[PDB]
Design an enzyme around this catalytic site. Structure first.
Site, PDB file in Angstrom:
ATOM      1  N   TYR A   1       0.176   5.661  54.494  1.00 10.75           N
ATOM      2  CA  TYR A   1       0.720   4.816  55.515  1.00 10.75           C
ATOM      3  C   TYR A   1      -0.301   3.723  55.823  1.00 10.75           C
ATOM      4  O   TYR A   1      -1.486   3.814  55.491  1.00 10.75           O
ATOM      5  CB  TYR A   1       1.134   5.658  56.726  1.00 10.75           C
ATOM      6  CG  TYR A   1       0.039   5.808  57.782  1.00 10.75           C
ATOM      7  CD1 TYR A   1      -0.083   4.884  58.844  1.00 10.75           C
ATOM      8  CD2 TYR A   1      -0.875   6.819  57.718  1.00 10.75           C
ATOM      9  CE1 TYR A   1      -1.070   5.009  59.796  1.00 10.75           C
ATOM     10  CE2 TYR A   1      -1.874   6.923  58.634  1.00 10.75           C
ATOM     11  CZ  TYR A   1      -1.947   6.035  59.701  1.00 10.75           C
ATOM     12  OH  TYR A   1      -2.977   6.118  60.597  1.00 10.75           O
TER      13      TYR A   1
ATOM     14  N   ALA B   1       9.111   4.766  47.816  1.00 16.91           N
ATOM     15  CA  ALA B   1       9.291   6.215  47.750  1.00 16.91           C
ATOM     16  C   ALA B   1       8.839   6.831  49.072  1.00 16.91           C
ATOM     17  O   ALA B   1       7.791   6.501  49.636  1.00 16.91           O
ATOM     18  CB  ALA B   1       8.526   6.811  46.595  1.00 16.91           C
TER      19      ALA B   1
ATOM     20  N   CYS C   1      -7.539   3.908  26.445  1.00 11.79           N
ATOM     21  CA  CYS C   1      -8.166   3.383  27.685  1.00 11.79           C
ATOM     22  C   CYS C   1      -9.696   3.385  27.597  1.00 11.79           C
ATOM     23  O   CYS C   1     -10.261   2.588  26.856  1.00 11.79           O
ATOM     24  CB  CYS C   1      -7.531   4.011  28.904  1.00 11.79           C
ATOM     25  SG  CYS C   1      -7.850   3.094  30.415  1.00 11.79           S
TER      26      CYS C   1
ATOM     27  N   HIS D   1      -1.837   4.515  28.558  1.00 16.11           N
ATOM     28  CA  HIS D   1      -1.941   5.965  28.423  1.00 16.11           C
ATOM     29  C   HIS D   1      -0.663   6.682  27.963  1.00 16.11           C
ATOM     30  O   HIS D   1       0.112   7.159  28.808  1.00 16.11           O
ATOM     31  CB  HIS D   1      -2.264   6.543  29.771  1.00 16.11           C
ATOM     32  CG  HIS D   1      -3.639   6.279  30.213  1.00 16.11           C
ATOM     33  ND1 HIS D   1      -3.935   5.293  31.141  1.00 16.11           N
ATOM     34  CD2 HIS D   1      -4.810   6.864  29.897  1.00 16.11           C
ATOM     35  CE1 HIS D   1      -5.237   5.295  31.387  1.00 16.11           C
ATOM     36  NE2 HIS D   1      -5.788   6.255  30.664  1.00 16.11           N
TER      37      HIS D   1
ATOM     38  N   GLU E   1      -0.494   9.576  26.631  1.00 12.51           N
ATOM     39  CA  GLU E   1      -0.665  10.941  27.025  1.00 12.51           C
ATOM     40  C   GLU E   1      -0.255  11.239  28.470  1.00 12.51           C
ATOM     41  O   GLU E   1       0.015  12.415  28.809  1.00 12.51           O
ATOM     42  CB  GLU E   1      -2.104  11.425  26.787  1.00 12.51           C
ATOM     43  CG  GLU E   1      -3.154  11.070  27.857  1.00 12.51           C
ATOM     44  CD  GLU E   1      -3.527   9.585  27.963  1.00 12.51           C
ATOM     45  OE1 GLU E   1      -3.042   8.740  27.190  1.00 12.51           O
ATOM     46  OE2 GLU E   1      -4.328   9.268  28.847  1.00 12.51           O
TER      47      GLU E   1
END
Ligand SMILES: Nc1ncnc2c1ncn2[C@@H]1O[C@H](COP(=O)(O)OP(=O)(O)O)[C@@H](O)[C@H]1O
Ligand SMILES: [Mg+2]
Ligand SMILES: [Mg+2]
Ligand SMILES: [Mg+2]
Length: 1288
Positions: A397, A671, A1128, A1253, A1255
């Site tokens: 928040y 979300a 990466c 990435h 993975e």
């Protein structure tokens, strides 16, 4: 390079690279111009300082030079004008220094005692009084951390060795009580009179003078911050003694609801039950990664770091996260952090050129930073720790509040000059480690982690310091320990925080019923000058204390050395409950106390207080229209788009993130809660949500608390949990204790949740914390001024999740649908203390509240039933900004319109739209509308439920009431207004060109969002025939200190049929592993050495400068059938090893993103035609992938090298925008790489390196957005299967 005497050592000065990009240069010249300093030019260069304990030969010297070449290839200039050198302050050591020195040492440069860095500014300004030159100097450095020098040679001061200062006694026997009074003032002990009495008696009894160290230790332990006197006090309120302390009222929630709780109030985290799943880790004996089916139980904690953040916000926020991560790791007998959360409350931002109409400058104390500075540097600090440690930051928040209001104490300033800086998280823990073990007599007592300095003792003592990579090294050891199960050697572990060792070591032996004896000179120190007091009491970071049996020390030592985690045995547990600290150097005893003397109490506090309660005033609506209100509310940072706080933080590390803040194809951060999977092999999981509503406490303390609990619930409700008793809360209470009305208010609010609401709902609060001086005072011209926070309860909710796949988001569907409001406000439509009132500089009358406890419970249970039966298309709860914002955000996330009618919500349209009562909007299929309304009705909700209308394709946001249009606007227009805060923040913090590109792309409604094109069948396991033979080739999963995604990398190769072996660089260096035994290699991601000396460079150079390990890599890569992948950090590393890799001559470097900011994005790429064997079958596919990097920009030596790379056909992946074209516009291309380049391969195709990435997203469930019909495997699984099949 320069080389001069520095006392018993030599200091070398090495010139480094240009330090400032052109937009940073222009920002400085613009700042000088605005302050009327006539500066013709400015140029800056890094400069490095090496303090050497012995000489370098020519070879070693060329090595050091090479170590110190890094960074983007910026335009270099011959120095001109006046030199101003900025360095850390003398007596401090930068985290950069710690990490760069470790690199030198791992490259075999033991002669390097310490490396440090400064920035040399060259300023041409031939005018300029010396007054103005101090203004120039002031602008180029942070007065809390850095100093400015006139010569390079002045950096010698940074490396002065001071002789150890002796302990000092305080002369009680020779002066009486006056000596304790004098020491109290001189050392800032802040002792109460009754504490002075207790100390005077204790030491009179012992017959000797206290040492300074013993008084300081006692003072830190007995502070409000460490003792929690307020939370354990007896109370009298309005004349009536009360039966319970605040703490006992919190515990009431556990006495009522013990269900699922494994540990509460007896550790620095709570634990609740999780799920039986495959815990994935590398065996101690084989080094192979394997699933272990067992309960993964769930720990939770939330902390704050409010005061230090007001002084130095970057390290204040970073260490607020770092402290909290240690609490998690030191739960029980060792545990593993999984995911984090972040909170900020600050005063008004007052962004230059973007002032909002509610904002007034009220002044501040000189010694604190502004709200804007906190929201600039603080989130970067918090994110720097979470990124470099490696936990994803998945919910949070951010509130702004600063206004003159008629509250409980009449008209005064209420706000957040002293901010809330909140950090919390979940982790996993084994069942047999939840209980702290017993401490055997003779147990070795250890400090795990960083060498101490004088930190925590112009308030320089509140300037913290973070080294996340040090904490990661410690976590690896802790992981090794819990991964030994029954052979875990950790008997007891605790974090080091407030009070440093002086608190943590006594607490540890005492928690075991033991004493200890300690040797001061066994403790690791980077500051030989320190007094015993400073050594024992400093608050240096990244330390843990633990107890291990003597016969386990060799194992512990092995574990630490393989991780490169420093540790020291500093004493022994004794039967006698005495605390002894000896000093071998001065041959004396700084501490010699019975524990009962040291840990003995003064009497508990009584607070006798009275209730203040504001009348508060009806909203004056003179200047309010619905349209203006919509515009204003969307511009309140509280309400507004939070992207600046979200993309700066990794949201994919662990491979277990199912639901992050960004939602849908348009990746809109709305979300309502976070969701992780429990393992890499399950759909069980964990969820995190936050509720908070501080401004309400300016009208009604208990309503503010009830609403924080309520909103936590409404934020988590569309996640599949089941029984509400699964949901466990942290309650963090922030207050200005002693401010009129706040004490009684605090008691009432704690009672409101602890004694009433939580017991009635069946919600436990098994963890929590308090911060009780949330106010700031200063003199502002003539007058005394004060800014006091509202009572600020932050509730974090934590839950086991039954199926992570069934989570709803705010992303509206446009299939045939019904929108239904659930108004748990029951038509009260309160407007007091809303965003609407705030944006018109008012507090208003009566706020929202929990209207009906059974209906709140019912709402939850009905949501659970709808979730489980898959009857919801979308959910979004109502909070700041009301129904208007809820609907707007849903439209933003769905990239669509709404047609809604509010005639049933009351005649007061403003109140119907902008009240912040609990509830929200569900979207269901049109055909399910009657059954859904029936379901809701059977939970008592029929009169709270209102059909609003529908989501529709298009750009119209329309609100009607009968035949009147209440409000109508372009959804795009609202969405871009809502974006303006994050735009302006990004613009002043990052490269403005990128901020502006990101912002401007939002205004294009034709953007189709993330979308895929697949060149192959995603569901065809091409590795299956090979896996079915049971032959499993090994893959070396290669990690260096600070690497953090090695586990999910292993799991991806494992799903493709490999035996994934953990190979640390320490394993290669010590001959425990040879690459000769492998046919496949993968260099994993993370922050090896914290990226100091350039991302991936220290890792690569440690290979290059050790000839044996170097030969080993070279041999591996020159074999005819070996495969390697660099992801990466590993891509960066391998790019620095071109000399060992055949066919890699055209490879580029990877440098600082053009945004000048870490980018955690879910970015769209396409697979391009190349020799890459790992990408076989995938060419022409386009799909999103996890991105998580600060230094991913492809940089070539010149255009000739870019063209050559391109013509050789070695480019394997490119960023594309959502229209599918190759791009360099941001953030579609997140780093500024030419021609979108983000993976390259070798001529033979056997080696592939890439920045994103794969993975992290091999499981469909870990893709932030994905097409609905995908199965369990994402397209990226094919990479790992292609590697298996290629090996045959
Ligand atoms: N300080 C923060 N750090 C990271 N993410 C945050 C922060 N503040 C807000 N967010 C995220 O941004 C989104 C919007 O936040 P907000 O509107 O405050 O949530 P809500 O209104 O549902 O409580 C959420 O996904 C939230 O987790
Ligand atoms: Mg919100
Ligand atoms: Mg919400
Ligand atoms: Mg909220």
């Amino acid at each position: 390079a320069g080389l001069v005497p520095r006392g018993s050592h030599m200091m070398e000065i090495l010139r480094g690279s240009p330090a400032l990009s052109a937009f940073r240069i222009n920002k400085l010249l613009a700042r000088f111009q605005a302050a009327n300093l006539q500066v013709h030019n400015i140029y800056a260069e890094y400069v490095h300082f090496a303090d050497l304990n012995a000489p370098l030969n020519d070879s070693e010297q060329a090595q050091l030079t090479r170590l110190l070449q890094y960074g983007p290839a910026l335009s270099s200039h011959t120095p001109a004008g006046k030199l101003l050198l900025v360095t850390p302050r003398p007596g401090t050591i930068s985290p950069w220094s710690s990490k760069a020195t470790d690199i030198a040492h791992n490259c075999g440069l033991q002669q390097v005692d310490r490396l440090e860095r400064g920035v040399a500014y060259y300023i041409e300004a031939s005018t300029l009084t010396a007054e103005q030159w101090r203004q120039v100097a002031a602008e180029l450095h942070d007065r809390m951390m850095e100093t400015v020098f006139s010569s390079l040679t002045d950096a010698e001061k940074l490396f002065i060795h001071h002789q150890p200062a002796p302990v000092s006694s305080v002369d009680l026997l020779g002066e009486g009580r006056q000596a304790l009074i004098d020491a109290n003032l001189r050392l800032g002990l802040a002792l109460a009179e009754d504490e002075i009495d207790y100390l005077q008696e204790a030491f009179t009894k012992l017959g000797r003078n206290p040492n300074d160290i013993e008084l300081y230790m006692f003072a830190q332990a007995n502070s409000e911050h460490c003792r929690h006197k307020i939370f354990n006090a007896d109370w009298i309120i309005d004349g009536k003694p009360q039966p319970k302390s605040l703490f006992k009222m919190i515990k009431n929630t556990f006495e009522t609801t013990p269900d699922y709780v494994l540990s509460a109030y007896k550790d620095n985290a709570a634990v609740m039950e999780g799920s039986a799943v495959g815990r994935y880790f590398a065996d101690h004996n084989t080094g192979r990664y394997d699933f272990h089916q067992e309960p993964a139980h769930i720990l939770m904690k939330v902390e704050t770091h409010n005061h230090p953040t007001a002084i130095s916000p970057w390290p204040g926020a970073a260490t607020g996260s770092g402290g909290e991560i240690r609490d998690e790791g030191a739960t029980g007998r060792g545990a593993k952090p999984k995911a984090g959360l972040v909170g900020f409350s600050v005063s008004n931002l007052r962004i230059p050129g973007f002032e909002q109409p509610w904002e007034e400058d009220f002044g501040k104390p000189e010694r604190i930073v502004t709200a804007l500075d906190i929201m600039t540097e603080g989130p970067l600090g918090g994110a720097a720790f979470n990124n470099e440690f490696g936990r994803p930051a998945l919910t949070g928040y951010f509130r702004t509040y600063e206004e003159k209001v008629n509250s409980h104490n009449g008209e005064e300033l209420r706000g957040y000059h002293k901010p809330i800086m909140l950090a919390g998280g979940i982790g996993n823990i084994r069942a047999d480690h939840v209980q702290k073990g017993e401490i055997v007599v003779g147990a070795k007592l250890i400090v795990l982690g960083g060498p101490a300095m004088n930190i925590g003792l112009l308030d320089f003592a509140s300037v913290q310091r973070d080294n996340p990579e040090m904490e990661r090294r410690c976590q690896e050891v802790i992981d090794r320990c819990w991964q030994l199960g029954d052979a875990n050697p950790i008997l007891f572990i605790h974090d080091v925080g407030a009070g440093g060792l002086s608190n943590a070591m006594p607490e540890l032996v005492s928690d075991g019923g033991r004493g200890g004896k300690f040797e001061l000179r066994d403790i690791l120190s980077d500051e030989p000058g320190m007094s015993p007091l400073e050594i024992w009491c400093n608050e240096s970071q990244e330390r843990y204390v633990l107890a291990v049996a003597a016969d386990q020390l060799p194992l512990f030592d092995e574990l630490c050395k393989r991780e490169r985690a420093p540790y020291a045995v500093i004493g022994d547990a004794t039967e006698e409950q005495h605390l002894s600290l000896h000093d071998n150097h001065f041959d004396n005893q700084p501490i010699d106390l019975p524990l009962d003397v040291l840990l003995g109490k003064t009497p508990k506090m009584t607070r006798d207080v009275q209730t203040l309660k504001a009348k508060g005033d009806a909203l004056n609506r003179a200047d309010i229209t619905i349209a203006d209100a919509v515009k204003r509310v969307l511009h309140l940072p509280t309400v507004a788009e939070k992207t600046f706080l979200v993309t700066i933080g990794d949201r994919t590390v662990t491979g277990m993130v199912a639901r992050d803040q960004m939602v849908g194809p348009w990746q809109v951060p709305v979300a309502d809660c976070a969701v992780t999977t429990a393992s890499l092999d399950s759909y069980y999981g964990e969820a995190m949500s936050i509720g908070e509503r501080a401004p309400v406490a300016l009208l009604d303390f208990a309503a503010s608390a009830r609403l924080a609990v309520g909103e936590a619930l409404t934020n988590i409700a569309a996640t599949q949990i089941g029984d509400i008793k699964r949901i466990k809360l942290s309650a963090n209470w922030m207050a200005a204790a002693g401010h009129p009305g706040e004490d009684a208010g605090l008691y009432d609010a704690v009672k409101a949740v602890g004694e009433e609401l939580c017991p009635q709902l069946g919600l436990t609060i098994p963890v929590g914390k308090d911060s009780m001086s949330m106010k700031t005072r200063w003199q502002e011209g003539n007058e005394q001024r004060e800014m006091t926070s509202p009572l600020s309860l932050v509730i974090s909710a934590f839950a086991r999740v039954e199926d992570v796949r069934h989570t709803l988001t705010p992303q509206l569907s446009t299939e045939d649908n019904a929108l239904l409001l659930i108004d748990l406000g029951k038509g009260h439509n309160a407007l007091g203390a809303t965003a609407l009132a705030q944006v018109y500089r008012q507090l208003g009358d009566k706020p929202a509240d929990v209207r009906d406890v059974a209906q709140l419970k019912g709402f939850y249970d009905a949501m659970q039933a709808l979730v489980a039966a898959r009857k919801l298309l979308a959910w979004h709860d109502r909070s700041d900004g009301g129904l208007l914002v809820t609907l707007a955000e849903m439209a933003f996330a769905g990239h669509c319109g709404v047609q809604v009618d509010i005639a049933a919500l009351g005649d007061d349209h403003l109140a119907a739209l902008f009240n912040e009562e609990l509830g929200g909007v569900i979207q269901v299929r049109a055909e399910d509308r009657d059954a859904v309304e029936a379901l809701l009705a059977q939970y008592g909700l029929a009169d709270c439920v209102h059909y609003l209308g529908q989501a529709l394709a298009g750009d119209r946001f329309v609100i009607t009431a009968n035949d009147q249009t209440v409000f109508s606007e372009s959804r795009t227009t609202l969405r871009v207004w809502w974006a303006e805060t994050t735009w302006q923040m990004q613009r002043l913090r990052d490269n403005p060109q990128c901020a502006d590109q990101e912002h401007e792309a939002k205004a294009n409604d034709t953007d189709p969002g993330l979308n895929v094109k697949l060149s192959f069948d995603i569901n065809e396991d091409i590795a299956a025939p090979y896996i079915a033979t049971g032959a499993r080739p090994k893959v070396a999963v290669l990690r260096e200190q600070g690497v953090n995604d090695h586990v999910e990398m292993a799991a991806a190769f494992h799903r493709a049929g490999f035996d994934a072996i953990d190979v640390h660089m320490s394993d290669l260096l010590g001959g425990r592993i040879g690459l000769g035994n492998f046919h496949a290699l993968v260099a994993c991601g993370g922050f090896s050495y914290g990226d100091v000396l350039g991302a991936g460079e220290g890792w690569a150079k440690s290979i290059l400068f050790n000839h044996r390990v170097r030969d080993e890599f070279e041999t591996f890569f020159h074999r005819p059938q070996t495969l390697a992948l660099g992801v990466c950090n590993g891509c960066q590393m391998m790019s620095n090893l071109r000399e060992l890799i055949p066919g890699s001559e055209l490879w580029p470097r990877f440098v600082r993103n053009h945004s000048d900011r870490f980018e955690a994005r879910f970015s769209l790429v396409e697979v391009t035609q190349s020799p890459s064997l790992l990408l076989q079958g995938m060419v022409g596919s386009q799909m999103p992938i996890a991105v998580s990097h600060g230094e991913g920009r492809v940089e070539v030596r010149d255009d000739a090298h870019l063209a050559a790379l391109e013509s050789k056909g070695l480019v394997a992946l490119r960023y594309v925008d959502n229209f599918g074209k190759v791009t360099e516009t941001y953030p579609a291309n997140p780093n500024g790489s030419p021609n979108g380049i983000t993976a390259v391969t070798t001529e033979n195709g056997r080696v592939t390196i890439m920045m994103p990435h794969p993975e992290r997203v091999f499981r469909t469930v870990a893709n932030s957005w994905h097409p609905e019909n995908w199965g369990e495997d994402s397209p990226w699984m094919r990479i790992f299967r292609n590697a298996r099949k290629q090996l045959g």
